[PDB]
């Protein structure tokens, strides 16, 4: 059994010639040569059975990506694990191998307007399919956007993905959230659980703004600082947008702040295309109900060179979890992970 950087990586005999890529919070990704299809692939070793959270993230992703099939979404083409639940200590998920990601690119490369336009198109084409399945990604950021040498984009990491639930989206002021801070919609800190499609559009808006300047538009250093960064550019919410926030603690917090004017997009981004900034404005709308939807975003004049709704596929049916995974112990989640991966075993 071959191992990478002092960690067991038993994926043989089908996958050999391992090379390190990255290491997550509860796993490791390596590139490996597939002896059946004779092509290099990415294998993600997962060790989640000691924590309920990691088991929940593993299962959600496996169930969603096995039912999804789209050019701009990472796939699960094979799953390797032990033949019994007793012997299963790890799970190896075989996915698409991509040379780089948008986080890596933005650190050192200046993106031409053509590149920004093409990247945004593929993100939204991928998101159209995700949202048509009534699924929310909930953690869109440059590191979860993989790219190959020809700039083909794939959305990855569905660990925080959920079925859309707009009727149960309301919550109190300063409710704790898991998803990456810099890409959190303003309503998360005010009165939202992130159970609507509009939280993903906000994250895409932040990604677009980041592609234009090679720096995160709202780099909050802590929970409430995130909202203050958003209000610093958007300005004070209108009376209309304030009236939509019925929660008194959230509304009175916004009312306590001095009046702040809107920073114009052309001042923040002097070299950006005017159509790119008009679409940015619509994605970074304070009110989630007035925020542009994925299909509307794809039809925006900025993406006219690529827009073709007949070549922007949707899922065949809406997604539905058989049971709620929020209140299941790590032991039961192990069984569910064992069951969902059974179809990939040699027998
Ligand atoms: C700071 C630690 O960094 C990360 O977690 C991600 N960046 C490194 C990286 C960069 C590229 C790739 C890569 C290259 N080709 N295919 C993939 C890939 C294949 N699957 C995934 C994936 O599911 N990634 C998510 C995070 O985006 C993830 C989720 C949970 C995890 F335990 C790990 Cl290790 C990774 C990525 C893999 C990796 Cl791990």
Identify the residue whose C-alpha is closest to ligand 1 atom 24: 157
Ligand 1 centroid–CA 313 distance in Å is 26
Distance CA(303)–CA(306), nearest Å, equals 6
Quick one: CA dihedral 113, 287, 174, 323, positive or negative?
A: negative
Identify the residue whose C-alpha is closest to ligand 1 atom 7: 22
Ligand 1 centroid–CA 95 distance in Å is 10
List the alpha helices (DSSP H) in 133-220.
186-190, 198-213
**Which experimental technique did the depositors report for determining this structure?**
X-ray
Task: Give the DSSP H/E element, type plus range, for residue 333.
Answer: helix 330-340
Identify the residue whose C-alpha is closest to ligand 1 atom 8: 22
For 4, phi then psi, to 5°, come to -120, 120
The DSSP annotation for 213-278 comes to: HTS-S---SSHHHHHHHHHHHH-SPPHHHHHT---HHHHHHHHHSPP-PPPPHHHH-TTS-HHHHH
Span(s) in the chain for CATH 1.10.510.10: 98-326
Q: Which of 257, 250, 285 is nearest to 175 (CA)?
A: 250
Q: Which of 184, 213, 197, 200 is nearest to 116 (CA)?
A: 213
Distance CA(197)–CA(291), nearest Å, equals 10
CATH topology for 98-326 is Transferase(Phosphotransferase); domain 1 (1.10.510)
Query: Which class does domain 1-97+327-347 fall in?
Result: alpha beta
The reply, when asked if residue 21 is annotated as ligand binding, is yes
Span(s) in the chain for CATH 3.30.200.20: 1-97+327-347
Q: Which of 267, 258, 206 is nearest to 236 (CA)?
A: 258
């Amino acid at each position: 059994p071959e191992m990478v950087r002092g960690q067991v990586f038993d994926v043989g005999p089908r996958y050999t010639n391992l090379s390190y890529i990255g290491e997550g919070a509860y796993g490791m990704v390596c590139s490996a040569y597939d002896n059946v299809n004779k092509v290099r692939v990415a294998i993600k070793k997962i060790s989640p059975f000691e924590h309920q959270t990691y088991c929940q993230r593993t299962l959600r992703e496996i169930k969603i990506l096995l039912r999804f099939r789209h050019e701009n979404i990472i796939g699960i083409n094979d799953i390797i694990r032990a033949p019994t639940i007793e012997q299963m200590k790890d799970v190896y998920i075989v996915q698409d191998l991509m040379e780089t990601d948008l986080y890596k690119l933005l650190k050192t490369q200046h993106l031409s307007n053509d590149h920004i336009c093409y990247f945004l198109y593929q993100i939204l084409r991928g998101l159209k399919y995700i949202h048509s399945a009534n699924v929310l990604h909930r953690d869109l950021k440059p590191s979860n956007l993989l790219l190959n040498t020809t700039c083909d984009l794939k959305i990855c990491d569905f660990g925080l993905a959920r079925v859309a639930d707009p009727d149960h989206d309301h919550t109190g002021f300063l409710t704790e959230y898991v998803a990456t801070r810099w890409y959190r919609a303003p309503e998360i800190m005010l009165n939202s659980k992130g159970y609507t499609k509009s939280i993903d559009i906000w994250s895409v808006g932040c990604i677009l703004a980041e592609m234009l300047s090679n720096r995160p538009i709202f780099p909050g250093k802590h929970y409430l600082d995130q909202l203050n960064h958003i209000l610093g550019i958007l300005g004070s919410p209108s009376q209309e947008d304030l009236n939509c926030i019925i929660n008194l603690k959230a509304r009175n917090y916004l009312l306590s702040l001095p009046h702040k004017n809107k920073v114009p997009w052309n001042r923040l981004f002097p070299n950006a295309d005017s159509k790119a900034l008009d679409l940015l404005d619509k994605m970074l709308t304070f009110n989630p109900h007035k925020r542009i939807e994925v299909e509307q975003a794809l039809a925006h004049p900025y993406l006219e060179q690529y827009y073709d709704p007949s070549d922007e596929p949707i899922a065949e049916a809406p997604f539905k979890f058989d049971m709620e995974l929020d209140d299941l112990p790590k032991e039961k989640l192990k069984e569910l992970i064992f069951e969902e991966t059974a179809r990939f075993q040699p027998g």
